[PDB]
Structures are given as C-alpha cells and as structure tokens.
Amino acid sequence: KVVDRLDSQPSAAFEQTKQVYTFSRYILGPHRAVVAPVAMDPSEKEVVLRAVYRQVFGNAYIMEEERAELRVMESQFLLGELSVKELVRALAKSSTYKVRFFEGAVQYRFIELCFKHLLGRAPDNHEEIAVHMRKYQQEGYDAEIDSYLDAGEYDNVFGDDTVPFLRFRGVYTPCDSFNRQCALQGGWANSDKAMGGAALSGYNGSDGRQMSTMIGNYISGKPIPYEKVAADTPLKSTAPNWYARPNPALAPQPAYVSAKEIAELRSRVSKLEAAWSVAVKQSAAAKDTVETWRAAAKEMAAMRGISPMGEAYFGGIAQKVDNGALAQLGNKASSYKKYLYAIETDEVSRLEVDLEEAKGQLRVLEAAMAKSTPMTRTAE
C-alpha cells in the first residue's frame, strides 16, 4: 500500500501537501499550488493575480488596453468578496476570453482548453467530452462554465482559494491522459494562440481560427506520439536535472541520414536484446564465484571470540579487534561502495543501458527517414 488517497479526493486533516504530490513532478517545477492567505497586502494581491492570468489565459499577452476590461472584477477580487474560484468563473465568462478561445474555435478545441484552464487536467475519456458538448448545445455558454467548477472535482482539488495549476497527480486513470496534458501544456515558452494556429490563420494576428490537432485521439482511443511528450513539455519546465543514464530528451532530427546506418543500428539492437534475454536468465544463481563456499566459510568463521576489544595476542603481541557490525564479517569501506559502480561494471546492466541508447538513436534516425523525394544525400 503506497498511496492512501488520490488527489481527486479532498485532503485529510493531518497533512499540508497531499501525499501523491510529495514524490511527483509537482515538487520539481513551477506547477504548484499558490494559495491566497487570510489578510492580503496589496503587493501580494498581485502575486495571486499574475498567477491567475498565467493559467486561465494560458500564457497569453494581456495588453494594458485590453486589461481594462477586467478592472471591474479585478477590484471585486482586491476587495475580497470574490474568491479565486469565483474570479475565474467571471474571467471565463468575460469578453476577452470568448474572443481568444471561443469565437473561432471548434467545439473540441474549446472543451479541451476549458479542461486545461479551469481544471488542471486534459480530457480523460470521450464521453466526458461528449456530455460537456451537450450542455452548451442545450444550455448555452453560460451554464457550461458551471459544469467544470460546480462539480465535486474543483472543490476537492482547488477548494476556493487556490489558483488552478497543471496537476501532476501521480495516478492517471488512463495512462494515456498523462501525455494528453503533457501535449496541451506544451512548453513554458508556448501559448494556445500559437498551438491552435490563431495568429497565422487570421489577419495581422486578429481573426484567428482556433483549430485543434489531436482530435482523433479523443474519439479513437489512440496514444500520443512520444515526440509531443518530450520536446516541448512540462517535463522540461519541471526537469529533475538528474544524471539519468537513459537520458529521456530526444535529440534533434538530423539532416543527412542514410538507409545504410539505419540497417546497422536496427540489427545492433537485435544482438543486444537477444543477449539480454540469455544473460538475465543466467544471473541470479551462478553469477557469484564466492557464494557456494559461503556456507562453509561461515561455519568455521566464528572462533576465539573476544569481549573487551583487543585480544588475540598471538604470542603476547598487541593485535586488537574491530568488533563492528561490518568488520566482524571482514568487510571494508569498499564493500558497500561497490554497489555504486555497478552501472557499467555489471554485465546485465551494461547490456540494458547500451540497448536503451540504441533505441534512442534508432527512434530519431528512423523518423528522420520519412522525407522522400527531393533529398540531397551524403557520403557519411
């Protein structure tokens, strides 16, 4: 039993952060929970207001001339009767929101943006998208913003004083949905005006068409390609800056590939993962030279014990004793240090690491070989 409650449930009475956030990617990057305290200074009412305009508008450029639409409900927040969950309801019902994300958007793109902005979560399955379409067609835009917020999910996750954040929940109910939100928040330096084509489709940046890719992955349950989860991603804004030995980041697609060097690499992984299947079976019994003598070298191991440390005079000479737990076995400092150098020293781990760099290089060398007719080539 590792996790005890998910983030879709309310927090219990005995924690500060939820449990699933404590070892997730939540701790590693900027996608955290900013809370408004009880009594707010006017300087730290800006720290809650700049975080709302980050999330609810998705890194858009709110100019000064168009932030004058919001001063009526800005001040209603700065006074303190609009909570954060009620400020974002009026901000979604605004005019500058409906111009940006509604009046040129296909109905799939508007629902998946509302899933990113109001909830912290890309759309899960398809009949959830379908029922939120069926509010708007029967009740209009007005009650449809009450669908996201006036359900159990906003109250349990964000309460009424936390600004929405992209959740890194740990447990994902399909495992496809961890990439759906990873492709939707695609970059710190991105925004939905760019990703939806709403600047190139229109005139001088206005009159944009907010069209969506990945529509078919909602209907047909199909995974996201791995490039759209590792290139521009929340996993780079929350990069752990480790020393991962399979380094997960994808290399740039090279110019000048050749079908020769793909064929050596493709055969090369088949020599390695066939060897891995015949080396993982061999280990775990006969890998160890000093293991069959361990029961004999342990039976005669204890003799001439010693209480006061420093006996075994050996003819009346000093010759003391260690009596530690480690050194009673005859071990040194290099006995526990060998576990740190088994990354390449080992034979089962050297094969697996060398396999995983090869399928890394093969996944980008193959995909660069998808451009065909006017290709100028090389001599290596």
Partner 1 sequence: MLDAFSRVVVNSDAKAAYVGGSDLQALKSFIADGNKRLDAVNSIVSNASCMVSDAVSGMICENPGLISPGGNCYTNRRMAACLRDGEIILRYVSYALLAGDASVLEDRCLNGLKETYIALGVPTNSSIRAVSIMKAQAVAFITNTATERKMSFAAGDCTSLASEVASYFDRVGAAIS
Partner 2 sequence: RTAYPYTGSGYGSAGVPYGQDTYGYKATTAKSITETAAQAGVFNTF
Partner 3 sequence: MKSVITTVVSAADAAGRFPSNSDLESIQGNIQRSAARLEAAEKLAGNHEAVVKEAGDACFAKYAYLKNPGEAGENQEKINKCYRDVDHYMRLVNYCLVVGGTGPLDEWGIAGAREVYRTLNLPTSAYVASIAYTRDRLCVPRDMSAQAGVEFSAYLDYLINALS
Which residues in the 339-368 window bind partner 2 by CB under 8 A? 347, 350-351
Question: Which DSSP symbol is given to 224?
Answer: P
- Member of 78, 90, 106, 231 binding partner 1 (CB under 8 A): 231
**Non-local CB neighbours of 309 within 8 Å, separated by 6+ positions:** 320, 321, 322, 323
- What are 217-223's contacts with CB under 8 Å, separation 24+? 217/180, 218/108, 218/112, 218/123, 218/126, 218/129, 219/126, 221/125, 221/126, 221/174, 221/176, 223/176, 223/179
Q: What span, in angstroms and rounded, lies between the C-alpha atoms of 247 and 328?
A: 41
Closest to partner 3 by CB, 205 vs 240, is 240
**Positions in 316-355 near partner 1 (CB under 8 A):** 337, 339-344, 346, 348-350, 352-353, 355
Quick check: 261 and 365 in contact, CB under 8 A? yes
One of 1, 260, 304, 377 touching partner 2 (CB under 8 A): 377
Contact status: 47 vs partner 3 (CB under 8 A): yes
CB nearer to partner 3: pick between 27 and 249:
27
Distance CA 231, CA 199 (A): 22
Alpha helices in the chain (DSSP H): 46-55, 71-79, 84-92, 96-101, 107-117, 126-149, 152-157, 177-184, 192-195, 216-219, 227-230, 234-237, 259-280, 296-299, 348-368
Residue (61 or 293) nearer to partner 1, CB: 61
Among 98, 187, 366, 369, binds partner 1 (CB under 8 A): 187
The tokens for 82 are 């609009």
Q: Is 181 in the site for partner 1 (CB under 8 A)?
A: no
Asked if residues 106 and 212 have their Cβ atoms less than 8 Å apart, the reply is: yes
Query: What own/partner pairs with CB < 8 Å and gap ≥ 24 does 353-358 have?
Result: 353/245, 353/246, 354/272, 355/269, 355/272, 355/273, 355/276, 356/246, 357/246, 358/265, 358/268, 358/269, 358/272
Burial class (CB in 10 A: 0-12, 13-18, 19+), 122: buried
Per-residue binder mask for partner 3 (CB under 8 A), 56-95, x = binder: --------x-------------------------------
Smallest gap, in angstroms, from Cβ of residue 59 to partner 3?
12
Binding residues for partner 1 restricted to 19-78, rule: CB under 8 A: 23-24, 30, 61, 63
Cα Rg, the chain, nearest whole Å? 30
Q: Which is nearer to partner 1, 204 or 376 (CB)?
A: 204
Select the span of 168-176, 291-299, 362-370, 372-380 touching partner 2 (CB under 8 A): 372-380
Considering the complex, what minimum distance in angstroms separates the CB of residue 243 from ligand PEB?
Answer: 12
The span from the CA of 168 to the CA of 174, in Å, is 14
Tell me which stretch binds ligand PEB (CB under 6 A): 128-136, 168-176, 213-221, 352-360. Answer: 168-176
Should residue 378 be labelled a site residue for partner 2 when binding is judged by CB under 8 A? yes
One character per residue 223-242, x = contact with ligand PEB (rule: CB under 6 A): -----------------x--
Segment 158-177, which members bind partner 3 (CB under 8 A)? 171, 173
Residue 293, binding choice from partner 1, ligand PEB, partner 2, none, Cβ under 5 to 8 Å by partner class: none
**Cα 371 to Cα 117: distance, rounded to the nearest angstrom:** 37
Angle at which helix 84-92 crosses helix 46-55, to 10 degrees, equals 40
Which residue ranges make up the site for ligand PEB (CB under 6 A)? Answer: 24-25, 59-61, 168, 170-173, 175, 178, 188-189, 191, 193-194, 199, 205, 240, 284
Which residue ranges make up the site for partner 3 (CB under 8 A)? Answer: 1-6, 8-9, 12-14, 16-17, 22-23, 27-28, 30, 32, 34, 42-44, 46-47, 50-51, 64, 152, 171, 173, 240-241, 324-327, 329, 331, 333, 335-337, 339-340
Which residue ranges make up the site for partner 2 (CB under 8 A)? Answer: 256, 275, 278-279, 282, 347, 350-351, 376-380
